[PDB]
């Protein structure tokens, strides 16, 4: 993985040694070259994962997340140009540096073969992600949103650190390949019950789990556009990736310990979907949408069926592209009217015909119109949970109804209707914004032709 | 609120329209249109405001029981089958300032005429504020009606949007 | 109840303005000022040749429009589909499955020539 780690490090010398006015062109151009070379991780075999060295390896679950991660860095650079134009050059270079380190920590986290190395990097993403929110947010609530984000994660991460170390002292190794052969069944004792909670609650808070989600509406709202894209695209998927890995050493205790987290999730889909129907903030509405879609991944991982693992992997890739696209569309309006209120600007389809088309495509994928990968993953999770208990179809179907309502409610509220009369500064869409949306939707729709590359190891 | 003549006049038009909805045929509507006029003619004038108010409430109660469940509505009116149908083609005027010069050159005459309108707007702005801050009570205005330009060559205050609004069939 | 003199005058002040505005929303005979768009030989050839009604040729001109359509939209696609079906699809097992033809009593088979006995003699009926 050094063929990706070293080039990512070199983005920092490039940014600081480049001319004053070519920093956005150099970093964007070369971060796109790194993304192109990440297609070499698709060399996957039907029996063995791709093992590089004692430290790093990549398999069918990490590869799609690695490709998504390196693809987002160039996109986040584009979306940040507008609101950093009047910023001091020295500080505008530190902003680009925090993103580079975040990518460096993310690719090493998705390939680490040793869980403690995964934990250290898993926990290193908090530092750059906090500074982005607290330093380059606009509102006064960024300071409090920084603390909520910081302490919700650590309150579950520190117990995970004890549990991981306890496993090494007993199994003797945390190398994931070793754990596939030396794994032993988990007996039913009160000590193992809390071992299960320590291993999972770190990943539940980050997904997040309903009831522990109060940090998401604050971090995804007060963060700048670049922070919101990475937060909702890859940093929620660290929770899913963690559970897909650490559930190997929790069976069969996961058969009964999963019940309380399936009811908070199945019911949490309805509660959070319903919240979106009455939100007055367009960025907040997109945030609460992440909770509903991330509640299906939790259910899929906890029932442990081959169909559910394929759906969860496809649900995570699909939601990362859709969720990021929605945040970008919301921010393009904010750059003109400079307010997040959803009812402030109406009938935007009259002024910006093409940007309204991006709104339509962004809405359809959110509600899983077939044969998009949004529907492929959401279908598999609904097929697997039915075998778990046929009554679950009642809850899955209801949420699909409520998803359509709020997905089409924001489209109607802002794009259709009659325009606001005193909003007279809606300038046409720049080529940057249109290019920014097209790089979100074109690759998403292209994966429909060959979806097998984003279905995961159990394909 | 709405005086007393206005309510009876408003109440009279609805009765004709709702009655017109039952009649359908144009011979019958005239047969009962006059009767309804006669029914009001019975209680015309008559003073005694306390008695007139009492009758109107009974008239309103009589009307509601008899209103048509599905009244006729004109297509281009609230509740019709064409209300707001053409608001999706009504682009505001300020959007023309953002045209690319390569597409302004396709209408050199129209934009030349726009320059004069904009030029007039800036020149006349100062007086319209002057005219409005002098012909108004001290404690702010108390009516939505605006006064006209008390001079020659001066445009009425607050005329830009009332004048340059989109056409009713813009395409 | 009618308009007060101040209001009726204001409505007239605006009325003159609006009619002037609607008069300005008109296009001069030259507009739109289209750019130097070039015409292909085919486009200019038909403009010169189509000047006269000449009902005898309107069938010919219609045939060209339809004939151009048929070759590009009905003959090229069927060529591509047939090549796709005959040499790629039908080279794999069960890609194209066909219902076996119906065989009635007293029939001959092309593959081998088998003949099936007609039937047992019927109890003739009427009506």
């Amino acid at each position: 993985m050094l063929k990706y780690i070293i080039p990512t490090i070199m983005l920092m010398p490039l940014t600081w040694l480049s001319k004053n006015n070519m920093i956005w062109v150099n970093s964007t151009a070369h971060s796109l070259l790194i993304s192109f070379t990440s297609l070499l991780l698709m060399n996957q075999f039907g029996d063995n994962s791709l093992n590089f060295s004692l430290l790093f390896f990549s398999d069918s679950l990490s590869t799609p997340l690695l490709i998504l991660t390196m693809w987002l860095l160039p996109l986040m650079l584009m979306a940040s140009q507008h609101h950093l134009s009047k910023e001091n050059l020295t500080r505008k270079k530190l902003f680009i540096t925090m993103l580079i380190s975040l990518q460096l920590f993310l690719i090493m986290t998705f390939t680490a073969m040793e869980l403690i190395l995964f934990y250290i990097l898993f926990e290193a993403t908090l530092v750059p992600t906090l500074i982005i929110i607290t330093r380059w947010g606009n509102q006064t609530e960024r300071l409090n949103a920084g603390l909520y984000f910081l302490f919700y994660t650590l309150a579950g991460s520190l117990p995970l650190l004890v549990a991981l170390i306890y496993i090494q002292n007993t199994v003797g190794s945390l190398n994931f390949l070793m754990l596939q052969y030396w794994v032993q069944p988990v007996h039913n004792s009160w000590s193992n019950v809390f071992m299960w909670l320590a291993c999972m609650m770190a990943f539940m808070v980050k997904m997040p789990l309903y009831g522990l989600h109060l940090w998401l509406p604050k971090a995804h709202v007060e963060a700048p556009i670049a922070g919101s894209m990475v937060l909702a695209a890859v940093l929620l998927k660290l929770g899913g990736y963690g559970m897909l890995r650490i559930t190997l050493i929790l069976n069969p205790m996961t058969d009964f310990m999963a019940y309380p987290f399936i009811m908070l999730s199945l019911w949490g889909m309805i509660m959070t979907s319903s919240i979106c129907l009455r939100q007055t903030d367009l960025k907040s509405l997109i945030a609460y949408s992440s909770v509903s879609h991330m509640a299906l991944v939790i259910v899929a991982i906890l029932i442990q069926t081959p169909w559910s693992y394929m759906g969860a992997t496809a649900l995570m890739i699909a939601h990362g592209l859709t969720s990021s696209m929605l945040f970008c569309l919301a921010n393009s309006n904010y750059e003109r009217i400079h307010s997040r209120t959803m009812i402030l600007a109406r009938g935007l389809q009259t002024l910006l015909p093409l940007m309204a088309t991006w709104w339509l495509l962004a809405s359809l994928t959110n509600l899983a119109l077939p044969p998009t990968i949004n529907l492929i993953g959401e279908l598999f999770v609904v097929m697997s949970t039915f075998s778990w208990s046929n009554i679950t179809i009642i809850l899955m179907g209801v949420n699909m109804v409520i998803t359509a309502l709020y997905s089409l409610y924001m489209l109607i509220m802002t794009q259709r209707g009659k325009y606001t009369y005193h909003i007279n500064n809606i300038s046409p869409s720049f080529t940057r914004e249109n290019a920014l949306m097209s790089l979100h939707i074109l690759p998403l729709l292209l994966l429909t032709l060959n979806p097998k590359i984003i279905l995961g190891p159990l394909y | 609120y709405l005086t007393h003549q206005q309510k009876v006049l408003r109440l009279y038009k609805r009765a004709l329209r709702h009655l017109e909805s039952w009649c359908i045929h144009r011979d019958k509507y005239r047969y009962f249109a006059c009767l309804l006029r006669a029914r009001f003619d019975e209680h015309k004038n008559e003073k005694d405001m306390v008695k007139a108010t009492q009758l109107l409430r009974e008239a309103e109660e009589e009307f509601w029981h008899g209103q048509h469940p599905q009244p006729y509505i004109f297509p281009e009116s609230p509740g019709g089958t064409s209300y707001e149908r053409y608001e999706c083609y009504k682009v505001p005027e300020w959007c023309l300032d953002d045209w690319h010069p390569s597409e302004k050159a396709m209408y050199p005459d129209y934009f030349a005429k726009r320059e004069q309108w904009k030029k007039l707007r800036r020149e006349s702005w100062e007086r319209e504020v002057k005219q409005l801050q002098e012909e108004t009570p001290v404690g702010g205005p108390r009516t939505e009606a605006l006064p006209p330009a008390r001079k020659q060559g001066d445009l009425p205050p607050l005329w830009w949007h009332i004048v340059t609004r989109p056409r009713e069939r813009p395409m | 109840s009618g308009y007060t003199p101040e209001e009726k005058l204001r409505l007239q002040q605006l009325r003159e303005l609006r009619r002037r505005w609607l008069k300005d929303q008109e296009l001069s005979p030259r507009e739109p000022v289209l750019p130097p768009q070039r015409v292909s030989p085919v486009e200019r050839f038909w403009n010169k040749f189509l000047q006269d009604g000449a009902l005898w040729k309107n069938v010919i001109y219609k045939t060209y429009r339809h004939s151009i359509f048929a070759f590009t939209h009905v003959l090229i696609p069927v060529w591509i589909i047939h090549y796709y079906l005959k040499y790629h699809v039908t080279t794999k097992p069960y890609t194209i499955v066909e219902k076996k033809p119906r065989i009635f009593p007293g029939d001959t088979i092309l593959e081998t020539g088998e003949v099936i006995p007609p039937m047992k003699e019927f109890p003739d009926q009427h009506h």
Binding site: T431 | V91, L96 | -
Partner: peptide, 12 residues
């Protein structure tokens, strides 16, 4: 009698 139809900029 053609009239000028106001439209948002279709160039960008």
């Amino acid at each position: 009698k053609r009239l000028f139809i106001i439209k948002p900029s279709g160039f960008y």
